[PDB]
């Protein structure tokens, strides 16, 4: 089970920044990789490590922190498209 995890929290407070660093380090220690800011994912072996990981993430969530969790297949994970921020020739047909 591919576990996609979004992480956010107000960063204004200094203790909030410290807690954000601590939670990020905890995510890296648990096997999660950061694709971009607030974007992470981890491969869970089965529903077992999935449920246990959900409990652990609920336990380690910092104050005011918010985590989104989504279950995704490998085919959907390979279809993940990340766009980081007007074509003269538009081709409708074979792309040559």
């Amino acid at each position: 089970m591919r576990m996609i995890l979004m992480f956010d929290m107000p960063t204004d407070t200094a203790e909030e920044r410290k807690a954000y660093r601590k939670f990020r380090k905890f995510l890296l220690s648990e096997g999660f990789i950061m694709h971009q800011f607030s974007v992470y994912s981890k491969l869970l072996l089965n529903h077992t490590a999935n449920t246990a990981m959900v409990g652990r993430l609920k336990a380690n969530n910092p104050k005011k922190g918010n985590i989104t969790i989504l279950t995704v297949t490998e085919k959907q994970f390979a279809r993940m498209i990340y766009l980081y921020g007007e074509e003269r020739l538009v081709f409708l047909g074979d792309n040559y």
């Binding site: 529903h47 077992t48 490590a49 999935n50 449920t51 246990a52 409990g55």
Partner: protein
């Protein structure tokens, strides 16, 4: 929760447990018949603090204690929900259960991957585990006292029943058991009304004389 009939001068209030003793067999049988036929007859009127008359569906009438079925779909469903809430109140136990059903899900998933057909599943939840366990109340070996106690325990589970009424149910229980029933009714806050032909000694009750005079009685 006040009940009123033509024989009474003023509507009498029923709070927690209430023992109503009718010394006249004619008025008692007529009142019980008016309890079973209550939707048809306008003589007996039961109203709440809003003065709104309660429907017979909201009224719960009980005569045979051991013949009544305590196990129903709604009672068992709400009971399973209550057990799920009790398991949810403890984080550690819920975590352990999640680990166990988790491992079972891993095994069954491996067995599904070993098969040639493509198989999909969702989850094994706690409510499904309780429904698979078949949790239900046991009235088979229960004594009449434990049966009435279980009825007082499941009356909170019944949503639609406004008031519980027992017909001549106090003859089976000893004085001490009646004290336990009343003392438990005060804690459960439910409204229970008992109807007996003869007065019970040692408990507060409302007595209706053959003269049709209603008087409070301490003993």
């Amino acid at each position: 929760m006040k009940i009123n009939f033509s024989l009474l001068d003023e509507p009498m209030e029923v709070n927690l447990g209430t023992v109503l003793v009718i010394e006249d067999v004619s008025v008692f049988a007529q009142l019980v018949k008016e309890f079973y036929q209550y939707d048809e007859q306008s003589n007996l009127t039961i109203f709440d603090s809003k003065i709104r008359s309660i429907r017979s569906s909201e009224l719960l009438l009980i005569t045979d204690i051991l013949g009544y079925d305590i196990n129903t779909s709604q009672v068992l469903k709400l009971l399973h929900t209550d057990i799920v809430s009790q398991l949810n109140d403890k984080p550690e136990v819920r975590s352990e259960i999640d680990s166990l059903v988790s491992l079972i899900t891993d095994i069954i998933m491996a067995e599904c991957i070993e098969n040639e057909l493509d198989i999909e599943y969702d989850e094994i939840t706690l409510l499904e585990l309780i429904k698979a366990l078949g949790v239900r109340i046991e009235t088979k070996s229960c004594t009449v006292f434990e049966k009435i106690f279980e009825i007082l325990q499941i009356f909170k589970y019944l949503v639609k029943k406004r008031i519980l009424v027992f017909v001549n149910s106090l003859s089976y229980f000893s004085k001490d058991e009646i004290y336990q029933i009343l003392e438990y009714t005060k804690l459960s806050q439910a409204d229970v009304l008992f109807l007996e032909p003869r007065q019970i000694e040692g408990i507060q009750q409302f007595i209706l004389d053959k003269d049709y005079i209603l008087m409070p009685y301490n003993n």
